[PDB]
């Protein structure tokens, strides 16, 4: 009931799937990437008691309904889950027919192709959108950065990569992921608080804890003197209302959760901090890109929204970088949407509709088409 169409700017933020339209300004879709299973079935008159309306209601059904990401590790283990996830989107919150609105498709690297293959065709059949398109979440924050040169540090919804760039020019060779997810930090948090006097395992228990991180948990630039600070610093020593109604007390954790992203010893991970992943990347970069980086040290990823994020970023680079060069990490507050924003852009980039995944193109070349000279 309008003009040609608006591309669908649908963005499965590694934790939440989100979305607006091309040229949109706010992803009108935002909500958990989980599926939920009650256990008991009190015989209950009548119905309306969905097994799997997780979408954005099921956390209302938290507890009895369990949790399921399909793309659990940024890895869609299952898809009908995610399928009806979409339908939920496009029919309750998108409440919109795919068939007539294009869409670009958010994706991080490292995917085996058939993931997209399948998602693609099924999105044409179940969806018959006018045409789709896919785009690396990473790249989609990249333009989303608009500093076409420099790396970006995508530690976002639950994701992590380094994205060296250079007026749009990025080196995949130097490009990397950090398996870390804010979910991961979640984990160690459960570890600590529970062992520290708490019994905190349950799905929405994880819900509360993630809330805890994203509201209060932080990091201090330093650690060891910042450890002594912790040794008696009462200010931190703050209890926060457990959403039961308890007031979950908090101290050194608030920060000792995230910081391990620089020291997976705490996660015990063999990996290395996100800073020196930046630095070894940059060293991989050409000789004097490095100053480009310095100006373009774009962080990305809201869960990383914590305090001092750059504070460290810079301090350690410093600790590693030649003071000769001047560093500057780059992280907008709005890093969640940034990826959505740049995707809006690109898809909304009217000089670019040639790229979208047409039903036909796929039809002649099936899904495999997607791969070469297209994604």
């Amino acid at each position: 009931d309008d003009e040609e169409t608006t591309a669908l700017v649908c963005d499965n933020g590694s934790g939440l799937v989100k979305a607006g339209f091309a040229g949109d300004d706010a992803p009108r879709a935002v909500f958990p990437s989980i599926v939920g299973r009650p256990r008991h079935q009190g015989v209950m008159v009548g119905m309306g008691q969905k097994d799997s309306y997780v979408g954005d209601e099921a956390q209302s059904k938290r507890g009895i309904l369990t949790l399921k990401y399909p793309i659990e590790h940024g890895i869609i283990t299952n898809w009908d889950d995610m399928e009806k996830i979409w339908h939920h989107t496009f029919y309750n919150e998108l409440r919109v027919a795919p068939e007539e609105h294009p869409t670009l498709l958010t994706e991080a690297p490292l995917n085996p192709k058939a993931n997209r293959e399948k998602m693609t065709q099924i999105m044409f059949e179940t969806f018959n959108v006018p045409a789709m398109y896919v785009a690396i979440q990473a790249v989609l924050s990249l333009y989303a950065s608009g500093r076409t040169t420099g790396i970006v540090l995508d530690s976002g919804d639950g994701v992590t990569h380094n994205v060296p760039i250079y007026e749009g020019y990025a080196l995949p060779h130097a490009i990397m992921r950090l398996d870390l997810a804010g979910r991961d930090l979640t984990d160690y948090l459960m570890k600590i608080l529970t062992e520290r006097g708490y019994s905190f395992v349950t799905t929405a228990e994880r819900e509360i804890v993630r809330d805890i991180k994203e509201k209060l948990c932080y990091v201090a630039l330093d650690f060891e003197n910042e450890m002594a600070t912790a040794a008696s610093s009462s200010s931190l020593e703050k209890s926060y209302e457990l959403p039961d109604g308890q007031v979950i007390t908090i101290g050194n954790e608030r920060f000792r959760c995230p910081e391990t992203l620089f020291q997976p010893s705490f996660i015990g991970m063999e990996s290395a901090g996100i800073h020196e992943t930046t630095y070894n990347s940059i060293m991989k970069c050409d000789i004097d890109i490095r100053k480009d980086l310095y100006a373009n040290n774009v962080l990305s990823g809201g869960t990383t929204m914590y305090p001092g994020i750059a504070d460290r970023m810079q301090k350690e680079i410093t600790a590693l970088a030649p003071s000769t060069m001047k560093i500057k990490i780059i992280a907008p507050p709005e890093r969640k949407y940034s990826v959505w924003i740049g995707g809006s852009i690109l898809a909304s980039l009217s000089t670019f509709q040639q790229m979208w995944i047409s039903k036909q193109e796929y039809d002649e070349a099936g899904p495999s088409i997607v791969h070469r000279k297209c994604f």
Partner: protein, 104 residues
Amino acid sequence: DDPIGLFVMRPQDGEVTVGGSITFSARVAGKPPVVKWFKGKWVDLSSKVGQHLQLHDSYDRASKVYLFELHITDAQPAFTGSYRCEVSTKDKFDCSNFNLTVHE
């Protein structure tokens, strides 16, 4: 009954009902041929091999027989349609399609 390629057993022409867990079977004396599940042409079925699209597949020395079988749990009209077990030895090939009509 129906003509046999390899298909000492043949994945049938399923006129199932909804919910009819139906076993399309090539129990065939069996290199043992690889099976190729197809609905559509660009379109695999392995990306759809799930609890509703399930397989038992195993050879016999006593009879030189191998079982391809496909139990279909929670039969749905969405999966009403054509399906294929294109099977090939190290040398041969076998192409003949079969039916899933999940009735009701």
